Amino acid sequence: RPRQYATVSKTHKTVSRAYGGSRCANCVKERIIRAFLIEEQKIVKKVVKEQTEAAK
Amino acid sequence: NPLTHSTPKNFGIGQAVQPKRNLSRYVKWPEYVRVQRQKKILSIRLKVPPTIAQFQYTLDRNTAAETFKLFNKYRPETAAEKKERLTKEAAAVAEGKSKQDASPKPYAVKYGLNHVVALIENKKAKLVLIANDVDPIELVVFLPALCKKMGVPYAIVKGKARLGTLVNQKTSAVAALTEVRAEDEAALAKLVSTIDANFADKYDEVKKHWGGGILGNKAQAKMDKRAKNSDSA
Amino acid sequence: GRVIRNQRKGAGSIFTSHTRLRQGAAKLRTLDYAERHGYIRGIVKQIVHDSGRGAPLAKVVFRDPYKYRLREEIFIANEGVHTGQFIYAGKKASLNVGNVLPLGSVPEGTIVSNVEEKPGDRGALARASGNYVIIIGHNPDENKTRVRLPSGAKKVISSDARGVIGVIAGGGRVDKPLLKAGRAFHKYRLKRNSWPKTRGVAMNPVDHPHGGGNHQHIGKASTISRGAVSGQKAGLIAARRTGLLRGSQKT
RNA sequence: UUACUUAUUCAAUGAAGCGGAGCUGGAAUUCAUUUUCCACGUUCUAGCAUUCAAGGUCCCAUUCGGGGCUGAUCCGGGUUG
RNA sequence: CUAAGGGUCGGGUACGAUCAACUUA
RNA sequence: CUUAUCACCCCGGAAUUGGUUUAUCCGGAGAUGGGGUCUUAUGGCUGGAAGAGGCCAGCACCUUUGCUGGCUCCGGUGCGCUUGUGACGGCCCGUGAAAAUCCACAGGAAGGAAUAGUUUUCAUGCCAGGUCGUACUGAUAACCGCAGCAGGUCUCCAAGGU
RNA sequence: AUGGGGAAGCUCCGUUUCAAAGGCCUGAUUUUAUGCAGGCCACCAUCGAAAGGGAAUCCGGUUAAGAUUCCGGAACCUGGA
Numbered sequence: 001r002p003r004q005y006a007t008v009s010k011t012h013k014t015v016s017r018a019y020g021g022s023r024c025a026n027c028v029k030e031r032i033i034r035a036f037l038i039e040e041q042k043i044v045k046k047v048v049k050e051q052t053e054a055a056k
Numbered sequence: 057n058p059l060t061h062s063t064p065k066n067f068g069i070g071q072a073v074q075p076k077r078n079l080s081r082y083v084k085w086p087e088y089v090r091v092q093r094q095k096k097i098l099s100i101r102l103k104v105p106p107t108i109a110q111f112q113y114t115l116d117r118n119t120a121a122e123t124f125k126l127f128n129k130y131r132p133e134t135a136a137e138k139k140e141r142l143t144k145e146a147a148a149v150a151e152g153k154s155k156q157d158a159s160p161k162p163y164a165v166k167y168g169l170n171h172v173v174a175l176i177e178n179k180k181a182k183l184v185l186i187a188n189d190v191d192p193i194e195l196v197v198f199l200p201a202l203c204k205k206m207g208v209p210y211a212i213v214k215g216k217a218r219l220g221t222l223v224n225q226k227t228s229a230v231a232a233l234t235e236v237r238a239e240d241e242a243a244l245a246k247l248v249s250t251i252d253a254n255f256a257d258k259y260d261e262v263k264k265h266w267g268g269g270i271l272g273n274k275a276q277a278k279m280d281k282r283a284k285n286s287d288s289a
Numbered sequence: 290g291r292v293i294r295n296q297r298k299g300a301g302s303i304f305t306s307h308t309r310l311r312q313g314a315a316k317l318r319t320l321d322y323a324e325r326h327g328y329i330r331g332i333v334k335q336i337v338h339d340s341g342r343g344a345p346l347a348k349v350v351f352r353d354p355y356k357y358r359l360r361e362e363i364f365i366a367n368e369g370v371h372t373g374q375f376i377y378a379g380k381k382a383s384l385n386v387g388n389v390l391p392l393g394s395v396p397e398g399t400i401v402s403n404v405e406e407k408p409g410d411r412g413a414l415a416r417a418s419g420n421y422v423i424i425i426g427h428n429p430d431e432n433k434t435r436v437r438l439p440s441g442a443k444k445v446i447s448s449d450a451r452g453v454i455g456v457i458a459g460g461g462r463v464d465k466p467l468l469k470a471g472r473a474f475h476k477y478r479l480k481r482n483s484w485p486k487t488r489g490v491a492m493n494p495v496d497h498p499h500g501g502g503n504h505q506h507i508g509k510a511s512t513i514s515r516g517a518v519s520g521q522k523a524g525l526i527a528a529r530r531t532g533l534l535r536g537s538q539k540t
Numbered sequence: 541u542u543a544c545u546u547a548u549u550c551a552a553u554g555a556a557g558c559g560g561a562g563c564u565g566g567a568a569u570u571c572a573u574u575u576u577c578c579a580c581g582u583u584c585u586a587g588c589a590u591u592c593a594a595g596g597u598c599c600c601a602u603u604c605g606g607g608g609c610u611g612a613u614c615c616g617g618g619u620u621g
Numbered sequence: 622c623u624a625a626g627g628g629u630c631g632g633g634u635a636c637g638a639u640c641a642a643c644u645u646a
Numbered sequence: 647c648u649u650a651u652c653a654c655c656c657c658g659g660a661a662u663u664g665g666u667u668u669a670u671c672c673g674g675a676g677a678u679g680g681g682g683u684c685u686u687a688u689g690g691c692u693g694g695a696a697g698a699g700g701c702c703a704g705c706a707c708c709u710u711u712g713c714u715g716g717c718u719c720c721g722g723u724g725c726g727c728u729u730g731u732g733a734c735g736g737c738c739c740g741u742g743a744a745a746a747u748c749c750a751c752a753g754g755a756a757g758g759a760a761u762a763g764u765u766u767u768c769a770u771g772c773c774a775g776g777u778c779g780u781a782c783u784g785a786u787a788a789c790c791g792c793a794g795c796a797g798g799u800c801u802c803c804a805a806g807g808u
Numbered sequence: 809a810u811g812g813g814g815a816a817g818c819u820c821c822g823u824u825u826c827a828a829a830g831g832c833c834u835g836a837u838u839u840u841a842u843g844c845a846g847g848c849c850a851c852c853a854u855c856g857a858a859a860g861g862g863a864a865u866c867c868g869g870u871u872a873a874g875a876u877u878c879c880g881g882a883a884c885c886u887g888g889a
Contacts, residue, residue, distance in 0.1 A: 003863055005749035010767045022751040034587040063594035069327025069581050074355050082619045084555045086828045101546045273616050274559050338741055373586040427543035462739050475740035
């Protein structure tokens with residue numbers, strides 16, 4: 001019950017991963033893949049826009 | 057030193073959290089702040105009768121200062137000077153048997169609206185200043201026209217508070233001189249000529265001049281947009 | 290006579306709407322700064338059933354441009370919108386189902402819904418399930434846009450008024466017969482106390498202008514003037530015509 | 541019938557970006573350096589975005605490390621319709 | 622009185638004792 | 647301490663499609679199969695705890711009071727009844743409160759070297775927890791119907807046989 | 809309720825509205841505890857369930873009548889250096 005989380009140790013309420021007690025493994029894993037790949041794709045779009053600085 | 061890096065954030069439409077700027081233009085000012093502004097705006101968007109707009113039509117600070125420099129030499133007595141002169145007078149009537157003529161005749165700026173209006177009616181005013189910050193203009197509106205018909209020199213001046221400081225008050229709305237010492241009769245005559253040439257001699261020209269009618273910043277910009285759109289060809 | 294049933298509804302005692310299970314006022318986001326010089330992206334996190342509403346609602350999370358906070362908005366769900374989808378709100382938002390373009394930014398014939406009557410009112414027109422607005426055309430001089438409303442009415446309003454591209458979801462609701470008084474019972478218990486309805490002619494004259502008689506009959510014409518007063522406006526109010534509608538009305 | 545807005549009326553917002561001038565460039569392009577308007581540089585994706593912001597330029601007993609300016613143009617204080 | 626209808630194991634590459642309940646005819 | 651349907655992870659990568667519920671769903675978006683965590687869900691064992699309580703046998707013989715000896719152990723069965731739980735499935739133009747409250751996560755402000763600094767979400771230790779209610783009836787006599795009135799008045803538990 | 813607006817007035821509306829409606833850490837830390845530059849806000853009253861949500865207790869014994877409250881054991885929760 002919500003109040004009994006006050007007196008129990010941290011180990012029970014969490015797990016030993018990033019976002020451990022709030023998002024399960026597969027969601028944080030999906031967030032990890034998503035975060036890396038968008039930022040990688042962002043660098044791709046950044047150079048595609050950057051060529052016009054060399055063209056002009 | 058290489059441990060730093062260049063982040064720079066982008067402040068486009070949906071790029072980053074906008075930085076804290078000066079939002080002083082969009083302040084939800086309190087009620088009493090709002091009234092003060094919209095009251096001044098209303099008094100500028102309306103056709104103000106020539107009874108007004110002769111006020112807020114004051115002399116330059118260059119003239120205002122040179123009047124006061126003469127005026128402060130004739131500032132009235134204080135509580136300290138009254139007490140030290142009252143007991144000096146009382147001690148004098150016994151030792152000299154004088155009829156309170158031992159104490160000198162003051163040469164003081166004569167303030168007070170009711171007193172000054174009586175001064176103007178009697179022609180006893182050698183020079184009269186009027187404030188423009190009298191929030192009920194009714195008290196001072198007739199003063200330029202009163203000063204004119206009676207032929208006394210008057211100047212409209214900035215600061216009812218400056219008048220209050222002159223007469224040892226918070227506000228006086230008028231200050232006046234009636235008699236100046238024999239040492240500096242020259243200064244007043246020279247100064248009155250400037251005042252006459254500035255306010256009294258232009259009074260009949262001011263009596264036909266209306267003020268107000270000025271519109272807001274965005275109103276004039278739209279007005280000029282009418283002109284440039286029309287003159288473009 | 291006594292105060293009649295339609296007269297008693299304005300007091301709002303037992304005729305106020307039953308609003309416990311509703312998810313909030315379905316509104317477009319505030320037309321703040323981003324929606325009018327750019328666009329803002331948001332994600333629809335859920336589409337939920339709103340009690341008493343035929344149409345589903347969409348919960349969308351936008352970011353706050355001025356503070357670090359996630360601002361949720363309650364949009365009416367357009368058909369085809371799914372959870373996990375981006376919707377773009379603003380003048381530079383693309384013409385896609387779910388986006389919140391201003392009316393002036395969309396071409397002729399665009400199907401929009403939850404359209405603003407005035408720019409910034411957060412949506413007034415075409416909000417019920419299966420309804421939409423069509424863009425008849427634009428009037429850029431005196432910036433305006435004329436649209437076709439679900440009733441068929443033509444209306445011209447400012448081109449800055451926004452709307453959701455697409456048609457409200459849940460359409461075809463009234464195509465199924467309710468088949469049962471009990472289904473009509475459940476429908477109106479989450480809306481308001483308007484059901485069942487006793488006919489006025491089955492009442493006594495104290496209760497209704499139609500009440501009384503040795504036969505159940507209205508007795509006077511059931512078409513009532515617009516200038517009639519309360520207690521009199523029972524029947525067909527200010528009716529231009531009556532009887533079975535034959536032919537068209539040039540609609 | 542109208543070249544208006546401040547009276548009055550209506551609607552939103554934690555009154556956040558309004559009106560002009562505009563800073564590199566686009567344009568069926570001026571016949572003499574600016575005669576309108578825009579990026580003010582975000583749309584494969586259910587990630588992220590906050591700590592006077594990092595950076596940059598002049599200064600300090602670089603002693604909890606700091607200051608100014610700029611990043612984030614200026615002017616008008618009409619919150620916006 | 623009769624018949625039918627179930628549960629539990631050790632596999633050199635068709636086998637059994639156990640045990641069990643009310644439905645039918 | 648141990649104990650689960652569901653869920654999830656690792657490993658051969660499946661048409662002769664396989665697994666599988668009473669109910670037919672699931673699998674290259676990775677099935678079957680083989681290996682793998684936690685929620686006293688629920689059960690079991692131990693502590694609590696046999697010293698309690700219950701069942702027998704025996705002594706007390708007018709100080710409004712006990713003492714003694716045992717036993718309390720093993721199981722089995724089910725379309726059973728009731729309640730709870732679980733995994734499901736059906737229904738809706740009906741999709742079936744709110745807040746207090748509690749925790750978790752993201753983050754990276756601040757702080758930490760001569761017996762020191764933090765851990766008081768680990769264990770153990772110390773003190774306090776006020777106020778108001780608490781009997782009884784709850785109905786052919788404790789309520790209301792003029793009454794000890796065949797009326798009315800909300801609800802929980804629920805043995806055997808047929 | 810207040811803000812405010814009606815109402816001759818008992819009062820009526822209104823409940824966040826066109827209101828100037830906000831704590832905790834070594835700030836300070838010796839006429840000092842606000843003599844005095846230490847942040848975050850964008851909170852808007854309050855009442856309304858003895859069947860809704862909720863911090864935590866059980867067994868055995870005990871009375872003419874009380875007990876999940878007394879007693880004997882055995883626990884738990886909240887606050888507190």
